[PDB]
Amino acid sequence: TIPHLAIDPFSLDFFDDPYPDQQTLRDAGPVVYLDKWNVYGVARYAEVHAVLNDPTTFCSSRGVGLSDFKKEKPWRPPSLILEADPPAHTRPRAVLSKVLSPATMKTIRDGFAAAADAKVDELLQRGCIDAIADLAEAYPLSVFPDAMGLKQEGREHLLPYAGLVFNAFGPPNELRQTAIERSAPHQAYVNEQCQRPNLAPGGFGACIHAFTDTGEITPDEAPLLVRSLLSAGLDTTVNGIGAAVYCLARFPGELQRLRSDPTLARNAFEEAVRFESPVQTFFRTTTREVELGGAVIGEGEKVLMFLGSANRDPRRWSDPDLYDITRKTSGHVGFGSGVHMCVGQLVARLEGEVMLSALARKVAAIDIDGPVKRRFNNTLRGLESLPVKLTPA
Ligand code: HEM
Ligand SMILES: CCCc1ccc(C(=O)O)cc1
Ligand SMILES: [Cl-]
**What is the CATH number for 243?**
1.10.630.10
φ and ψ at 250, to 5 degrees? Answer: -90, -25
Look at the chain and report how many structural domains it folds into: 1
**231 alpha carbon – ligand 2 mean position (Å):** 6
d(CA 134, CA 314): 35
Residue type, 28: A
φ and ψ at 187, to 5 degrees? Answer: -60, -45
Expressed in angstroms, the distance from the first to the final Cα of the chain is: 58
Gyration radius from the chain CA atoms:
20
Is residue 237 lining ligand 1, measured as CB closer than 6 Å? yes
d(CA 22, CA 301): 21
**83 alpha carbon – ligand 2 mean position (Å):** 9
Which of 89, 65, 391, 386 minimizes the C-alpha distance to 244?
386
What is the number of H-type helices and E-type strands within the chain?
Answer: 16, 13
Answer whether 22's CB lies under 8 Å from 43's CB. yes
* Ligand 2 pocket, mutate which of 64, 76, 81, 82 (most atoms under 8 A from CB): 82
Is residue 168 lining ligand 2, measured as CB closer than 6 Å? no
- DSSP 8-state secondary structure symbol assigned to residue 79: P
Which of 142, 366, 364 minimizes the C-alpha distance to 247?
366
User: Which residues form the domain of 96?
Assistant: 1-393
89 annotated ligand binder: yes
Nearest ligand by distance to the CA of 169:
2
Residue 299 neighbours by CB distance under 10 Å: 11
* Ligand 2 pocket, mutate which of 165, 190, 221, 229 (most atoms under 8 A from CB): 165
Give me the sign of the Cα torsion angle 229, 234, 239, 244: positive
Give me the sign of the Cα torsion angle 84, 85, 87, 92: positive
Residue 314 DSSP SS3: coil
Nearest ligand by distance to the CA of 278:
1
Looking at the CA of residue 336, tell me the nearest atom of ligand 1. Answer: 10
φ and ψ at 108, to 5 degrees? Answer: -115, -15
Answer whether 194's CB lies under 8 Å from 223's CB. yes
Is residue 348 lining ligand 1, measured as CB closer than 6 Å? yes
Strand 363-368: give its sheet, edge to edge.
Answer: 128-130, 387-392, 363-368
**320 alpha carbon – ligand 3 mean position (Å):** 37
**174 alpha carbon – ligand 2 mean position (Å):** 21
Which of 279, 193, 209 minimizes the C-alpha distance to 239?
279
Helical H runs in 17-157? 19-28, 45-52, 90-99, 102-126, 138-148
Residue type, 6: A
Query: Taking every pair of C-alpha atoms in the chain, what is the biggest distance, in angstroms?
Result: 60
272-285 core/surface letters (b: 16 or more CB in 10 A; e: else): bbbbbbbbbbbbbb
284 annotated ligand binder: yes
d(CA 334, CA 99): 22
Is residue 164 lining ligand 2, measured as CB closer than 6 Å? no
Torsion of CA 172, 178, 181, 183, to 10 degrees: -100
Check whether the bond before 87 is cis (ω within 30° of 0). yes
- DSSP 8-state secondary structure symbol assigned to residue 219: G
d(CA 81, CA 101): 16
**92 alpha carbon – ligand 2 mean position (Å):** 13
Is residue 64 lining ligand 1, measured as CB closer than 6 Å? yes
Residue 291 DSSP SS3: strand
Question: Alpha carbon of 340 to those of 123, 233, 344: distances in Å?
Answer: 36, 15, 10
d(CA 89, CA 340): 9
Which of 281, 278, 298 minimizes the C-alpha distance to 290?
298
The helix-helix angle for 252-260 and 235-250 (nearest 10°) equals 100
Answer whether 262's CB lies under 8 Å from 361's CB. yes
Q: Whose CA is nearest to atom 5 of ligand 2?
A: 232
| Strand-strand pairing, 302-306 and 39-42 | parallel
Q: Which residues pair with 39 in a beta bridge?
A: 34
Looking at the CA of residue 169, tell me the nearest atom of ligand 2. Answer: 12
Residue 345 neighbours by CB distance under 10 Å: 15
Which of 330, 314, 319, 350 minimizes the C-alpha distance to 271?
330
Residue type, 238: V
Report residues near ion ligand 3: CB below 5 Å: 76, 187
